[PDB]
Each structure stands twice: as C-alpha cells, then as structure tokens.
C-alpha cells in the first residue's frame, strides 16, 4: 500500500508539473523574437472576426437579459423605503464589481474559448502545424501569436459592450414600465461610480481574465492527441479550467482591491 499509493499519487504529480511546464514554454516561444508587425497585421484583423465580431451576438442579446432580470429583482425589495433614486446603484455598481467581466468571461470561454481549442486541435489532426514547421517558420509565432493577442483585446472591448447594454437593459424595467421618475435615475447614479473604483477597476479585471482564458484555450488545442476524440475531450476541459480560473480569481481581485 505504501509502494502503491505513493507511486500512483507520484505519477499524477509529475504529469501535473509537466502540464504547466509545457504551457509556460508555449507562451514564451510565442511572444518574444524578432518584430513582425508588418506580417502579423493582416493576420491580427483576420483573427479579430472569430474572437471579437462573432462573439458579439452572444453578448448583445444577452446583455438586455441580464439588466432586465437584475433591474426587476432589485426593485421590489427597494420599494419599502424609497422607489425614487433607486436602480442606479446596485445595478451599475454590481455590473462593474462582480457582474460584467465575470459573466462575459463565461460567455467568452464557451463561445470563443471552445472555438480556439477546436481550431488548433483540428489543424493538429489534419497535420497542418507539423507541415508549416517543415517548410517555413514554425507555427508557434504564426498561428498561435495572432490568436493570443486577439483575445486580450476583444474581451476588454466586449466587456464595455456588456456593461453599457446591461445598464440600458436595466433602464427598460424602470422606465416606461413601473416608472420611478427617471429624472431621479440620473445625476445620482453618476455620483456613486467613479474612476479607479468602478470604471478603471472594471478594466483591470478584464485584462487579467483575458490572459487566463486564452492561455488554457490555446494550450488544450495544442496538447490534444490528433484524433477525433481528443479534440472533443480538450473542448470540455477548456470550459472547466476557465470557469475555475475566472471564479477562482474573482475572490483574488475582490479581496485585493475592494
């Protein structure tokens, strides 16, 4: 038992340690080197469509569904004291502290996180990454490098669309439906939010969550086995490992700043 339980737990300890070692060497060999700003310029805009533009449909129509639920649940419990000057706080304050960059990250890891894993894993099964390094520059700085920088730009940009629609989505259950004198909705909601606490602090969480999502989404598609079942297995592990990295770092950033 002593030679069997330690050997089974010791085999998984090296394989876990070798997993992070391959992810560190993949990101280091994809960011440094010679500057190729003139060659990656048509490659960055091409990878900005399936990351930022194609993921805009899952955020815009879901942005009015977040604010309509949050605006309706945050109204009937605030009528016991004052119906006016409500719903500016607890909606815009909640969409800049916990909601927002966390909720958009679960939509980024499900739509764009699962697509970037299945795209690199399909090219590995059809022998496209091995064929590129056998005749030209290796694909670590050719197809992985424009896909990593496209995720750290779109997800901070898509969070601003998720906030502004969800703020306007909360202004539909308060205005023209059980109205709360919407002149009081403004010039007091702006007094609660400020810079470096709600506006800039929302952009801090967006850059951090964009790195830890696109790192696992580009590593599971790179370390998968070239078969039909290895791509579907790495697609499931992308949504699992990113949900534990967004909700896990949500406790990290809340206790540090707030």
């Amino acid at each position: 038992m002593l030679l069997n339980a330690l050997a089974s737990l010791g085999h998984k300890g090296i394989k876990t340690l070798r997993t992070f070692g391959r992810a560190g060497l993949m990101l280091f060999n994809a960011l440094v080197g010679k500057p190729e700003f003139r060659k990656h310029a048509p490659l960055l805009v091409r990878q900005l469509y399936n990351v930022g533009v194609l993921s805009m449909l899952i955020i815009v129509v879901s942005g009015v569904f977040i604010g309509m639920v949050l605006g309706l649940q945050g109204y009937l419990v605030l009528t016991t004291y004052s119906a006016e000057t409500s719903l500016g706080m607890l909606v815009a304050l909640s969409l800049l502290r916990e909601l927002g960059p966390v909720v958009a990250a679960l939509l980024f890891a499900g739509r764009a996180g699962s697509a970037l894993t299945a795209e690199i894993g399909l090219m590995r099964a059809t022998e496209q990454l091995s064929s590129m390094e056998m005749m030209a520059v290796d694909p670590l700085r050719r197809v992985i490098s424009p896909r990593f920088w496209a995720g750290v730009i779109s997800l901070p940009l898509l969070t601003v669309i998720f906030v502004a629609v969800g703020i306007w989505g909360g202004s539909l259950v308060g205005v023209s439906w059980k109205g709360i004198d919407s002149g009081f909705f403004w010039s007091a909601m702006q007094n609660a939010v400020d810079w470096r606490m709600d506006l800039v602090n929302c952009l801090i969480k967006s850059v951090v969550f964009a790195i830890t999502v696109t790192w696992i989404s580009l590593f599971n598609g790179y370390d998968a086995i070239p078969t039909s079942a290895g791509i579907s297995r790495a697609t499931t592990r992308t949504v699992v490992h990113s949900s534990l990295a967004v909700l896990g770092l949500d406790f990290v950033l809340t206790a540090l700043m707030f």
Partner: protein, 261 residues
C-alpha cells in the same frame, strides 16, 4: 551518397519503434520503405526533418547531422524537403492558389506578375490548374494529395518524403499518383522516400526496397530481387497470406475454461 540515417534507435516511454535500422539510397533514386500497419511508419520521416530528437543515433544529410545543428541551421535544411502527408495538409482559410504560393510568398522575392505565372504552371503538372479558386473542403481525397504535391515542388526540394500515399483511394486515381512521381523524377530529378504497405503499386517505379519487421530491417534489395528471396517474413508481406510468422490467433488459454465452463 546517402541522405537518410545510418544507425538510430527510437524508443518511446512504453514501447519501442526502431532498433538499429539502416537506410541508404543514392541521389535521384526512388526508395520504398514498406511495412505493416501499427508500426511507426509516420514517425520514420519525422527523424529526417527534425521534428523529434532520437534517443541514440544520428541522421547523416550531405555531411551534416539533423539532431546536432541549431535552430537557425535547421530552418535552412528544411527549405528543401517539403514532406507530403497522408491527409490533406491544406489551409482551410485559403484556396488552392494561395496554398502553393504560401512557401513562395515568404521565401522567394518574386513580384506579383511573376508569381501568378509560377503557380499556374505548377498546378498544370499535377492536373489541378482549373481548380485554383476552389476550397480545400470542396476537394476530394484524391485531389487533396495532388494539390499538396504541387506545394511540395514550390521551393525546388531535394528529398521529398511521401507519408502513405493512395492508402484508401480507388484504382482510377491511384495510378495517377504513381505516374506523377515518374514525371517529377525523370524530368527534374529528386530523391523520393515513399513509405507504404501495398505491394504491387509501389514496386513499379522504385529502384530500391526496404522491409521493416519486428522493429528491425529484415531485408532490402530492388523491385526484382525482392521476389526471389526465400524468407518466412518477406514472403508473408509480399503476396499476403494468413499463415507465416503471424500466428493468426490471439494468445489464449486451453480452450476449455472459456468455452464450456
């Protein structure tokens, strides 16, 4: 001279692939390294290009060594190999005209009116000139390997490595892929290393043959000398039968405990 390995030994974490093998082919001669399925026929061509490092051994390529050079020296040697793969190794984001010109748009200094005339005659040799604007998803299994053959002859290589061609195709397009190697060798001149398993479709144009059995090279020779060779392992692969070194049954017990317990 010889351009392949001399004496290597590739061994994985659990099983073994190669154990003291030797490959020798003159320049401009088509060789045929045959072998059954399940063994590492795909990873044999990866040791020449330098994708993985072997355990014990060296690969001699024109007086140089593949696992001993640096990263900048490996990219110079890799500009004249252009290894062809089994499945379609074509980029889905580009068409056929941009796939063949993809080694030409980053290595050659040809201008835009001159590059359009180079790809259009490279596709005429493989018979895919009219399908230059089509997508690789629209191509079939036979036309996908022919489009990669025109991409393989873009940078004028010296050692083309075919990784299992015409493995599951009809005999109509199977004879076309055999005929395409004969026009790319008798008119231009290039050493072709073809690994396969089918006997009567590769022993027609290749001047040398190699048989790999039990992680070792058991025999060699030519297309005509391999027929008159008394050996129990060679005569089972060529003119394939059920008996021989393969025991035809899985290793089991006494046939009295499973049946009728």
């Amino acid at each position: 001279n010889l351009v392949d390995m001399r004496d290597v030994s590739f061994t994985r974490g659990n099983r073994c692939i190669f154990d003291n093998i030797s490959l020798t082919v003159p320049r401009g001669k088509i060789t045929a390294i045959m072998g059954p399925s399940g063994i590492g026929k795909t990873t044999l061509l990866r040791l020449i290009g330098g994708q993985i490092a072997p355990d014990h051994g060296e690969i001699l390529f024109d007086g140089e060594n593949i696992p001993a050079m640096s990263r900048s020296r490996l990219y110079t040697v890799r500009k004249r190999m252009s290894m062809l793969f089994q499945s379609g190794a074509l980029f889905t984001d580009m068409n056929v005209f941009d796939n063949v010109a993809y080694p030409l748009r980053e290595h050659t200094q040809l201008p835009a009116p001159l590059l359009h005339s180079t790809v259009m005659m490279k596709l005429e040799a493989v018979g895919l000139r009219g399908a230059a604007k089509l997508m690789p998803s629209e191509l079939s299994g036979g036309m996908a390997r022919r489009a990669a053959l025109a991409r393989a002859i873009a940078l004028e290589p010296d050692l083309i490595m075919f990784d299992e061609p015409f493995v599951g195709q009809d005999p109509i397009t199977m004879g076309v892929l055999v005929k395409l190697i004969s026009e790319l060798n008798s008119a231009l001149g290039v050493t072709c290393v073809v690994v396969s398993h089918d006997v009567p479709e590769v022993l027609s144009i290749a001047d040398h043959a190699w048989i790999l059995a039990d992680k070792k090279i058991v025999a060699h020779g030519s297309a005509q000398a391999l027929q008159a060779n008394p050996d129990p392992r060679v005569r089972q692969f060529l003119d394939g039968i059920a008996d021989g070194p393969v025991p035809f049954r899985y290793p089991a017990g006494d046939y009295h405990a499973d049946l009728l317990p």
